[PDB]
């Protein structure tokens, strides 16, 4: 059993606890500076014919690299997910993810999602923060998404291949992983208590 | 047409293919992460003959020493940066165009169409950390034996530039001269290599 938060203690995510059984190596063994390269092969979107602007891909990749750097050094929970993902996939170069810079937040983890992406692994990010914001439910009321939480959320999708909807849990394993990590990073935003907004 | 630093040993009959390459790779600024240069350059283990597989433990030993050499070269040598950066824009940013590391095998790099014909069209860079006669090179201070720093850099310059050692009207070739320039910028004591083959 690994660290958790008080907001998860009643009805913890079983799929997260199932995954904690697999990813047990919480030691820092990968170069924080190269986590972006281990994760991403190059630019790529959900639809293959649609090309990604080179300059946006560079803007997302650089901020991403810094978030992976901060997350890996401060959060033991994140290292376990990263380290395990390296043994299974990311050490192999052909099994890395495409970065859909500029496109809508999402990660191809479902058999349907891969059928929609021509069987291509994509993780779409954007910096539409500098518009209508997205909000999430907290014990302190709705809070706006910061790019740290948005990015981490989609990354946890990629490292774990888990989805947000979980039977009998209001958050799902990805949100809980995201919550655990951001707190270990010293992130102030309050935890997300439910996947769906009201 | 902006000539870059050279060595006193090259000014008479400088390598034209090196100076021709200096015109293309002109960005000497440090923009890549030195710690990840090995990842940009090498995808994984792989040898000259495809059926021959590489020992897992040896590949790790070469890749680790390599990573440290590229780190040293990239941070200290501007000439190396121009070659590394230029190689990144053209090929290594693309993941399918990266090199295989033939750890343990004899020093060599597939840069000629013939070399590729022998490797079934696979890009490989063979290194080793290995009785027989040691290897020596020509210097103004007499024969010198190769250190792994020079051996690795030499083969890497083959990969970054796709140039070969054989040059008409030059005794060294562009790869050797690049290697000499770089090792001096890295503060390497060994004397420059004045000729490819002994004369
Ligand atoms: Cl989502
Ligand atoms: Cl050679
Ligand atoms: Zn999600
Ligand atoms: Zn050579």
Numbering used by the authors:
A (entry chain B): 27 to 156, 160 to 227
B (entry chain A): 25 to 154, 159 to 227
What wording appears in the published article?
Here, we report that the zinc metalloprotease T3SS effector proteins GtgA, GogA, and PipA from S. enterica cleave a subset of NF-κB subunits comprising p65, RelB, and cRel, whereas NleC from EPEC/EHEC cleaves all five NF-κB subunits. GtgA, in both its apo-form and in complex with p65, has a globular structure, with the catalytic core assuming a Zincin-like fold. The active-site helix (αG) sits at the bottom of a cleft formed between an upper NSD and a lower CSD. Similar to NleC, the active-site cleft of GtgA is highly negatively charged, and the active-site cleft mimics the shape of the DNA major groove.
The structure of Zn2+-bound GtgA(20–228)E183Q was solved at 2.6 Å resolution by molecular replacement using the coordinates of GtgA in complex with p65. No electron density was visible for residues 20–24, 157, and 158 and the C-terminal Asn-228. GtgA(20–228)E183Q crystals belong to space group I121 with two molecules in the a.u. that overlap with a root mean square deviation (RMSD; Cα of residues 27–154 and 160–227) of 0.2 Å. The two molecules are covalently linked by a disulfide bond between Cys-44 of each chain. This is likely a crystallization artifact, as the elution volume of GtgA(20–228)E183Q following size-exclusion chromatography was indicative of a monomeric protein, and the disulfide bond is absent in the structure of the GtgA–p65 complex. In the GtgA apo structure, Tyr-224 is 3.9 Å from the active-site zinc, suggesting that this residue, which is conserved in GogA, PipA, and NleC, stabilizes the tetrahedral intermediate. The active site of GtgA is surrounded by a large negatively charged surface formed by αF, the upper rim residues, and the loop connecting helices αC and αD, which folds down over the incomplete ψ-loop. An overlap of the apo-GtgA with the GtgA chain in the complex structures demonstrates that this region clashes sterically with residues in the p65 NTD chain. In GtgA, the ψ-loop motif is incomplete as, in both the complex and apo structures, the lowermost strand residues Phe-131 to Val-135, which form the upper rim, are not in the β-sheet.
